[PDB]
Structures are given as C-alpha cells and as structure tokens.
Amino acid sequence: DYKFWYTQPVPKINDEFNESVNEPFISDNKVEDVRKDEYKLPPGYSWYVCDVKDEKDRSEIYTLLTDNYVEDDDNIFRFNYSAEFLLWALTSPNYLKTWHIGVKYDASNKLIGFISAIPTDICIHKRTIKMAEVNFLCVHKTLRSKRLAPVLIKEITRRINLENIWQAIYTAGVYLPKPVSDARYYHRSINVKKLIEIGFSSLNSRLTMSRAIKLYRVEDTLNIKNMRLMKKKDVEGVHKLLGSYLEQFNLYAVFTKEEIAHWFLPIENVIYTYVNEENGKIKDMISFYSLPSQILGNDKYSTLNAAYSFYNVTTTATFKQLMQDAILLAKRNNFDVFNALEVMQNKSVFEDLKFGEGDGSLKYYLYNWKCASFAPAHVGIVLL
Ligand SMILES: CCCCCCCCCCCCCC(=O)CSCCNC(=O)CCNC(=O)[C@H](O)C(C)(C)COP(=O)(O)OP(=O)(O)OC[C@H]1O[C@@H](n2cnc3c(N)ncnc32)[C@H](O)[C@@H]1OP(=O)(O)O
Ligand SMILES: COc1cccc(COC(=O)c2sc3ccccc3c2OC2CCNCC2)c1
Ligand SMILES: [Cl-]
Ligand SMILES: [Mg+2]
C-alpha cells in the first residue's frame, strides 16, 4: 500500500496509458485557491528558509546530506555532494529561494530535514510543460519512518503551486507510484585497484589483480584530438547542438541559452564539459559531473571519486569513440569510476567500453501527469 502516494495526482500501481494520452491528472488548477498556510510540523520543529548563497546555510545543508543522504543497499557508500555542487544544482536560472526548504529542531537549532526544487521546462511526449525538478529530499537518520517526508513533499508542492506550476519531475531508486521510465546504471572502472580494495569490484581466480588492471587500461590519447574545456564563447554552439539532439527523446529539458551556460560551463570539482569546435562550430560535446561517495568503514580510503555521464553528443565520430573519450577525460581528472544510466544512446556502448551492470536502477517520475511509460533509450534527461 502507498497510503500517502495514493492521495496524490500520480498513477495507481496498475494504471497503464495509451501513447495518445498525455495530460495532467488534475487540470484547470487555480493559484488563488492554493493554501497560504505552511503545513504543520510535529511539536518542536520549524520551517527554515535556506539561503544556498550563504556559505553557512549552505554548509548546514551539506552536513545534513553528508551524514544522512542516499546509501547503496550494502551501505558501504553514501553520496557526498560537495557544497559547491549544491550551490550549482540549486541556483540555476530563475531559481526561487523559497523552494529551498529546511526543517530545524528548535531546541538544538540544527537542520534535520530538507527538500528542494528548481524550475525547468520539460518536454514530455512533445508537450513542453513548466515544471519543478525536485531533489535532495532528506530526513536525519534519527527521525526516519515518522511521516516527515510527506510533510516535506506537501509543503514544497504548495510552494510550487503558488507560482502557478502544477507538474514536477523527480527520480528515486525506490519504487513509487509510478515510474514513466526505469534506467539501470552501469559503471566503468578507471582506478581498478582502489575499486577492489574497497569492495566495489572483485577478482576471480581467473582474473588476478595485474590482469584486472590491464583489462581496464586506457590509451591517454583522445579520439577527437581538439576536445577541450568549454568556454563562454561556446554557449550558443552548445545550445544549438544539444537542443537539436534532445528533440528526438520522449522526455527531456528544453534549455535556454542562459540554462546552457549555467548547466555546462565548467566548474572544477562540479561540472566538466568538453567541446570540439570546427569553423567556430560546436560539433561534439562530452559532459559529466562530480559526485563523490563517502566510503563507510574502510581503513584505507574515505572517498570514492566518481564522474557521472551527463550529456554527450557526437557528429564527427561514432558514439563509442565519443564515450571512450569521455572515459579518458574523467581519468585525466582523477576520477576512480565513470557511471552512466542506460538513457539516450548509452546502452549501446556499455559492452564494448567495459562497463559493468550495477545493482539497481533509477526510476523517473512525473507529478500530476498521465502518459504512456517508455523504455529508458527514450529518456533524454539526466538529473543531479
Ligand atoms: C507540482 C509540484 C509537485 C511537487 C512534488 C513532487 C513529488 C516529489 C517527491 C519527492 C522526490 C524527491 C527526489 C529526491 O530527493 C532524489 S531520491 C532521494 C531521496 N532521499 C533519500 O533517499 C535520502 C535517504 N533517505 C531519507 O532521507 C528518508 O528515507 C526520506 C526522506 C527519503 C524518506 O523519509 P522516511 O523517514 O523514510 O519516510 P517517512 O518520512 O515516514 O515517509 C514515508 C512516505 O514517503 C515516501 N517516500 C519514501 N522515500 C521517498 C522518495 N525518495 N521520494 C518520494 N517519496 C518517498 C514513502 O513511499 C511513504 O509514502 P507511502 O506511505 O505512500 O509509501
Ligand atoms: C552511493 O550509492 C550508489 C552506488 C553506486 C551507484 C549509484 C547510482 O545511483 C543513481 O541514482 C544514478 S547512477 C547515474 C549515472 C549517471 C548519471 C546519473 C546517475 C544516477 O542518478 C543521479 C541523478 C539522480 N540523483 C542522484 C544521482 C549509487
Ligand atoms: Cl494534508
Ligand atoms: Mg520521517
């Protein structure tokens, strides 16, 4: 049963829609009727408006996530998004401070809950809808299974609806009512030895340590020799290349020139974008973001450095060549592992490029939207 989810404008567990259905569950909503009062929290807890632009507020959000955010099923790893990453993720064009919602415990003044949204135009099945992208829902490990999460969700929904937005996109590893797509992740080993010493990867009697190192070795030469860090001048070119590529997919964000500069211009230890320019034209792009995991209870290593495949477009190479280059660029930036979802064209290169299947999948969800579900090849958006 999904006692909370079932009260919400999302599909029931059995709902399945034709490709021709593509619409809200609840249309003709009115901003004027949205509740003005904040949702009621348990006694001794208060809403707090986080200023992601303030170093100190931002560090409180960081601590909460470092200690309490997503772990894998074996709880060896916990996501450790850096402060400077959270600042990029939360301050895209037209972002609203009042969509960055904390909850404090009054007696300690400590942040013990968070939820965020940013505004994004989302094209679902060729209809572009102004939506909210929701992320970084977190409750402190000590406060789990007390029905705080639905209060966080309902408060942000109300804050979102105040801006006349009635749809959202979000992703979770947990299964909820009901995904529009479901994409397994794959991982390409870069620093083999580390990955074995921490348990992520393993050896058979056939595959010895030296043999595993050799298996994953890469040639430090790019397939596209002029692939270079993106610069401000490249923004219009990236806009045209990415914008045109993304139109083939069933689900994707429609990016303005301003969002392209926000989402792609490199920031050390956050976002890496490389371009291939020919006649002042951007004809190829690789991008990936930095998402470390903290390694729980390993005597030797505290952090796994991990590049996450973001948006990759080639017109002068094979997609395999392009991704092979993405892997090398991540190795050049001291990543231990390169992670990708089986979205867009990704899956076609995983065998050849020596990716291993992960343990699970990332589900893609819409709020207050009814449509046909689809295979993840047709997914054209990567969240943070
Ligand atoms: C138009 C605007 C629309 C606005 C909003 C759109 C929707 C946005 C939705 C959010 C999108 C966020 C995307 C995102 O951030 C990326 S997915 C990452 C979520 N964060 C984590 O997993 C961190 C580790 N865990 C936690 O901090 C807690 O376990 C959380 C806070 C997850 C749940 O706290 P708790 O102490 O374990 O649980 P209770 O408080 O007792 O609450 C249980 C109720 O929460 C439902 N639940 C559990 N996990 C969920 C999840 N990941 N999405 C949605 N729902 C989730 C659950 O199914 C149940 O409902 P039910 O009884 O019906 O089954
Ligand atoms: C620490 O636990 C993990 C250990 C190993 C692997 C994972 C992976 O989980 C995910 O959801 C993934 S993979 C991937 C690969 C490329 C691009 C995105 C993602 C992704 O979603 C991201 C976007 C949604 N918000 C969290 C990360 C977890
Ligand atoms: Cl209610
Ligand atoms: Mg709770």
UniProtKB/TrEMBL annotation:
The keyword Transferase applies. Pfam families: NMT, NMT_C. Coiled coil: none annotated. GO terms for cellular component: cytoplasm. SUPFAM superfamilies: Acyl-CoA N-acyltransferases (Nat) (SSF55729). Keywords: Acyltransferase, Metal-binding, Transferase. It comes from the Eukaryota. Its EC number is 2.3.1.97. Belongs to the NMT family. Heterodimer composed of NMT and AK2; AK2 myristoylation stabilizes the complex. It catalyses: N-terminal glycyl-[protein] + tetradecanoyl-CoA = N-tetradecanoylglycyl-[protein] + CoA + H(+). This is Glycylpeptide N-tetradecanoyltransferase. It comes from Plasmodium vivax (strain Salvador I). It is an enzyme of class 2 (transferase). Mg(2+) 1 binds at residue 143. Residues 28-181 form the Glycylpeptide N-tetradecanoyltransferase N-terminal domain. Tetradecanoyl-CoA binds at residues 2, 4-5, 69, 136-137, 139, 145, 147-149. One of its GO terms (molecular function) is metal ion binding.
